Amino acid sequence: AEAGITGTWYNQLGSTFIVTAGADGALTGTYESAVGNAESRYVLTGRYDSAPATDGSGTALGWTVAWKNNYRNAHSATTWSGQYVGGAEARINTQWLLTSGTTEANAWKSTLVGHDTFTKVKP
Amino acid sequence: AEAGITGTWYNQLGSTFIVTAGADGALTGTYESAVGNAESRYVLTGRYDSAPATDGSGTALGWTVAWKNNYRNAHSATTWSGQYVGGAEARINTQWLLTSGTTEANAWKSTLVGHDTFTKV
């Protein structure tokens, strides 16, 4: 449900995700790196599947962050795909892909994969 | 077809893979990298699922290569998961995971993912 998703979330590496879920399935916000001052904020956009999910099923969602802002340009973008699971302890469990822009020759090793779990802290 | 997996396969990057499929699910061979070279050969071991597949399905398999031989040690290993499809043009379509040994702080980016299609051409 949009409300449950909306809020501030953190993951085990110390990064910050601030998101607002709109009624039209949109996801917007900012993502901040693990500690490190104020200018570590990047724009994120995503989508969530507003489910009739009376199954205790999670809500599927995903979002993208291109690692470029006014202070830095890492020439890479990450996409997180996962599910939002509500309750008193809501969590968003994801798997992510981080692709860096490479030349033809290193394209083979341009993508990293991992997983992150986010815990909600504020609305 | 069943032991049609046995043979020499090549992928788009130039690497060669030579394997023997045992009648009970084993996959053994050598994987050689860039240039062909001489000891760009690494041991590979894997498993494949021997099944009836009336519905024209491919054969699931996977294998690993630790990137260490008596000449190099890249502190990493790759696992390929995919399926074999035989026919006039047999192919092995895979997705792979390459994990490097890192320290905690770099563990978040220890794994690369990709895909490779191997042919006998």
Partner: peptide, 8 residues
């Protein structure tokens, strides 16, 4: 890395 192409 021995998994990539050659370094030619």
């Amino acid at each position: 890395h021995p998994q990539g192409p050659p370094c030619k």
